[PDB]
Design a protein around this nucleic acid. Structure first.
Ligand SMILES: Nc1ncnc2c1ncn2[C@@H]1O[C@H](COP(=O)(O)OP(=O)(O)OP(=O)(O)O)[C@@H](O)[C@H]1O
Ligand SMILES: [Ca+2]
Ligand SMILES: [Ca+2]
Ligand SMILES: [Ca+2]
Ligand SMILES: [Ca+2]
Ligand SMILES: [Ca+2]
Length: 903
DNA sequence: CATGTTAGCAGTCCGCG
DNA sequence: GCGGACTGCTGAC
């Protein structure tokens, strides 16, 4: 097979590389790497090396990496550019792997681990590691085994061995319900003392050295804890054995009362699943406990236990170990679904970077662009210093707050990357400038055509048309992969709806799920078979379709994020290709594009509807338009439609056959106006929205910019079995809004859009009556707790203290002195509840770590002093008031003359 | 070491015969 | 009691 790297490090003048050889064996090597950098040279001097502007450079081959570094310093002192890749391990990767890397994940050792540490005196701080490690579960992807290290003897208690037989039993049977599919994969190893456990853990680690190291919170807890605990017992050089090159770096950061640390293990690529999840999932969660996330992702229940975790090992060591094991398996299950390890590997090898560098779009793009330019013997510019400067972004139309009955939406496919490609925006394609007219002069086609030679943006920039830019070139490759995966995702989505439709009429049969590829639209044969399937087979097929859709989602949305990240990086001062002329060329072109196409759509729709000056576009943001379709529907008359699906079909056809071709002509004109390289403004129909035919539903409403709700029947070609709400910006979409309040507000919206005012009033009345019976967690607000200390004046709120921070301080005073009360961690999330006047906490609110029950010592007092009136008014009524006033609707029946009668 | 800008709502502080 | 300037937080692109 073709060789590929696993890890790469620079240590002094050596490159340390772990890799997979031609026979598929893991190998390591130390290389005294001889880097090159480049300096500009006279034109007369023959060379094969040119900078991106075509100026000749001479190559400086260095005896070692330190020499290269020292040379950069001297060049800086002289005042001349030192060109070429200054991150030498990227250079090394590019030289060693001068071909498209084809990697084999089955040869890559991925390790998933977690540790337990009993602590009777508060959270066990990794930097101090003063408590024994009493469990480790380490899953190895190559062995497909869960290696369990179990401490039987501890200063905090001597316990018996863990029983695998009891672990497999149902909980209702006294067991731990360790999933049966991993029972046979567990290798269990008990130890009579911690030193033996840790020693054997290190020997194991040496035999099975992780390449990718993952797990839940491993970077902030497990890794530094293991490292510091081993250091305290055996010495630092023993602790350094966690690195295959025996090198680590300690990063102390650093709460300021007290502190913590991150450990770099050289020759390992740490990808903490919590970090993967936050970057790649596109959720914002109220809490990031593994229990919370597992439940959200997998619909498994909380791993319940009686008493505090500080006492679980002594009282129920059996459950303690099982739960250690399950927590490790849960990360694997989340990854089986989400496939973030797969994505990280794809992206990392595609760029030729250290795998952990996928967290950095700038490092990722630097490597991609360097490799691309290198292949053509071109030489990359030196990184330069730049002050941070603000610059303009997108246009967002101010909508008239209102109900909007029938709506059709359109937006640009991959807007900013498409703008980059259309205009040919790259550092090396800049041709010059032109004198700018006011933006609205371009929007209304009155300004002079900028150029008849070059491709233009209304920011004043001109670009060559007849040559490729590396930025356009490389952004296109990633865009094309994105498009492939999104296609797979949407096919799976459409496939899912076919299955949901068939679930209305399941067959009474024992049969099998159909063996199909969900990435492709079902054929007629498959659809016929589906209509004969049982509920069992259908539901299983639906699970598989949704898993296929999630996988396509992960793959497409993050490649979308990466290409959009390139457009953003042009405006980040650390990017090698930072240039506000290029960043603003994109954003300004976007502003024109949106407002240009608004004009064109209003013009077209007036023409075809036989009218003039009516506003059809009611809203737009960056690259989208929202078109009121009321007049389209009224032109033919609602009477003519059989059911909802008929008018949906009608608008679908109208958008595709009439509007889109009008839009396309509109944008082709704009392309010629800017004399662009290639027409790439593709504005496809997004949503078709309206109330059910013959209902009192209002269809949609806007309260303002970035705030709206739509009852959607068709979304990018997916015709739903059941209407789906598209809600943006409203409190239902915010992780700070209480769970049950999100739910109730969403049902309030569903009822408004689908059913009418009366239905809304019915639900409101009921929710108001029952509010006080909801679980306290379900009705608590959520916030991030940043800069707690800044507002901590003797345990009391200082000036300008935010509400949620006040709550934390109230909590800190209530718990002061209690050894095992969970501390609020700086920067993490808290639940927040308001308190009534005269409460024993001495303040108007309390807050505590989110995803958790509030400590039992104060729980009852919280429950008793909870201010429901404030909670209902703030979280539920006030947002609902905003929705309903905008929609011109009442959530309570207003008083009127009819109140004089007895109905 | 290192994607971007635009934007609304909740809260504090302050003024206000 | 309620606005306006302000910080903080949270999303929509
Ligand atoms: N996370 C982000 N970082 C930087 N720029 C962004 C981001 N999200 C959106 N934008 C900018 O807004 C534009 C429009 O956003 P949108 O969500 O419509 O994505 P898109 O790139 O057009 O992809 P799609 O084809 O899915 O619409 C992007 O092309 C860019
Ligand atoms: Ca644990
Ligand atoms: Ca778009
Ligand atoms: Ca059937
Ligand atoms: Ca959009
Ligand atoms: Ca689309």
């Amino acid at each position: 097979m073709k060789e590929f790297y696993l890890t790469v490090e620079q240590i002094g003048d050596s490159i340390f590389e772990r890799y997979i050889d031609s026979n598929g064996r893991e190998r390591t090597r130390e290389v005294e790497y001889k880097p090159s950098l480049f300096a500009h040279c006279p034109e007369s001097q023959a060379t094969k090396y040119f900078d991106i502007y075509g100026k000749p450079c001479t190559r400086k081959l260095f005896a070692n990496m330190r020499d290269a570094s020292q040379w950069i310093k001297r060049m800086e002192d002289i005042g001349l550019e030192a060109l070429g890749m200054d991150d030498f391990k990227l250079a090394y990767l590019s030289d060693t792997y001068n071909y498209e890397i084809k990697y084999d994940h089955t040869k890559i050792r991925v390790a998933n681990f977690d540790i337990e540490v009993t602590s009777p005196d508060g959270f066990p701080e990794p930097s101090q590691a003063k408590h024994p490690i009493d469990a480790i579960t380490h899953y190895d992807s190559i062995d497909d085994r869960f290696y369990v290290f179990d401490l039987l003897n501890s200063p905090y208690g001597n316990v018996e061995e863990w029983s695998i037989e009891i672990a497999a039993k149902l909980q209702e049977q006294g067991g731990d319900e360790v999933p049966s599919e991993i029972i046979d994969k567990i290798i269990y190893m008990p130890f009579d003392n911690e030193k033996e456990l840790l020693m054997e853990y290190l020997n194991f680690w040496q035999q099975k050295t992780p390449v990718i190291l993952t797990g839940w919170n491993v970077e902030s807890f497990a890794i530094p804890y293991v490292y510091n605990r081993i250091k305290n017992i055996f010495g630092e050089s023993t602790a350094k054995r966690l690195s295959p090159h025996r090198k680590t770096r300690v990063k102390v950061i650093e709460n300021m009362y007290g502190s913590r640390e991150i450990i770099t293990l050289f020759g390992i690529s740490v990808l903490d699943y919590i970090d993967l999840y936050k970057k790649f999932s596109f959720t914002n969660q109220p809490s990031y406990s593994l229990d919370y996330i597992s439940e959200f992702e997998l619909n498994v229940g909380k791993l319940k236990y009686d008493g505090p975790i500080s006492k679980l090992r002594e009282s129920n060591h059996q459950r303690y170990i099982s739960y250690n094991i399950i927590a490790v398996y849960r990360v694997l299950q989340i990854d089986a679904k989400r496939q973030f390890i797969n994505l990280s590997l794809d992206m990392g090898y595609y760029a030729k970077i250290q795998i952990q560098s996928v967290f950095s779009p700038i490092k990722t793009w630097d490597a991609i662009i360097f490799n691309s330019l290198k292949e053509q013997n071109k030489v990359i510019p030196q990184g330069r210093s730049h002050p941070v400067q603000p610059y303009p972004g997108a246009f967002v139309k101010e909508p008239i707050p209102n109900r909007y009955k029938y709506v059709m939406s359109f937006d640009l496919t991959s807007a900013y990357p498409s703008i980059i490609r259309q205009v040919n925006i790259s550092p090396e394609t800049i041709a010059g400038t032109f004198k700018v007219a006011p933006l609205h002069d371009y929007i209304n086609a009155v300004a002079e055509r900028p150029s008849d030679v070059y491709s233009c943006s209304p920011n004043g920039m001109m670009y060559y048309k007849d040559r490729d830019g590396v930025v356009p070139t490389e952004i296109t490759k990633v865009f094309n992969q994105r498009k492939e995966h999104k296609g797979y995702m949407l096919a799976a989505q459409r496939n899912g709806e076919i299955i949901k439709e068939a679930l209305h009429n399941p067959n009474l049969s024992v049969d099998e799920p159909l063996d199909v590829d969900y990435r492709f639209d079902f054929s007629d044969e498959i659809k016929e078979k589906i209509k004969k399937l049982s509920a069992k087979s259908l539901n299983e097929m639906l699970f598989r379709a949704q898993r296929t859709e999630v996988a396509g989602m992960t793959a497409q949305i993050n490649r979308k994020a990466l290409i959009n990240g390139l457009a953003g990086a042009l405006g980040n001062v650390w990017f090698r290709y930072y240039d506000l002329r290029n960043a603003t060329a994109i954003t300004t072109f976007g502003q024109m594009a949106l407002q240009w196409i608004e004009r064109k759509v209003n013009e077209y729709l007036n023409e075809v509807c036989g009218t003039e000056g009516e506003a059809f576009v009611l809203y737009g943001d960056t690259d989208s338009i929202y078109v009121s379709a009321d007049k389209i529907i009224d032109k033919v008359g609602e009477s003519k439609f059989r059911d909802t699906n008929h008018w949906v079909d009608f608008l679908d056809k109208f958008a595709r056959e009439r509007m889109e071709p009008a839009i396309d002509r509109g944008f082709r004109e704009m392309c010629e106006y800017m004399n662009n390289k290639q027409h790439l403004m593709f504005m496809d129909r997004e949503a078709i929205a309206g109330p059910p035919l013959g209902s009192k539903g209002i269809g949609g409403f806007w309260t303002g910019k970035k705030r709206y709700a739509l009852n959607v029947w068709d979304m990018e070609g997916t015709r739903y079995a059941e209407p789906k709400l598209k809600i943006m910006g409203l409190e239902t979409q915010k992780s700070s809004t209480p769970k049950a309040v999100q739910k109730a507000l969403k049902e309030c919206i569903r009822r408004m859009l689908q059913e009418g005012e009366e239905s809304l009033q019915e639900y409101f009345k009921e929710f108001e009556k029952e509010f006080r019976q909801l679980n306290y967690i379900s009705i608590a607000s959520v916030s991030s707790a940043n800069n707690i200390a800044k507002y901590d004046v003797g345990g009391f709120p200082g000036p300008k203290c935010p509400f949620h921070i006040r709550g934390i301080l109230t909590y800190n005073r209530a718990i002061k002195g209690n050894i095992d009360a969970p501390q609020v961690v700086e920067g993490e999330k808290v639940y927040v509840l308001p308190l009534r006047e005269g409460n024993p906490f001495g303040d108007k609110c309390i807050a505590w770590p989110s995803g958790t029950e509030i400590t039992d010592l104060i729980k009852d007092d919280v429950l008793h002093w909870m201010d429901y009136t404030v909670l209902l008014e703030k979280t539920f009524i006030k947002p609902l008031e905003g929705f309903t006033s905008a929609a011109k609707l009442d959530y309570e029946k207003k008083a009127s003359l009819f109140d004089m009668f007895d109905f």
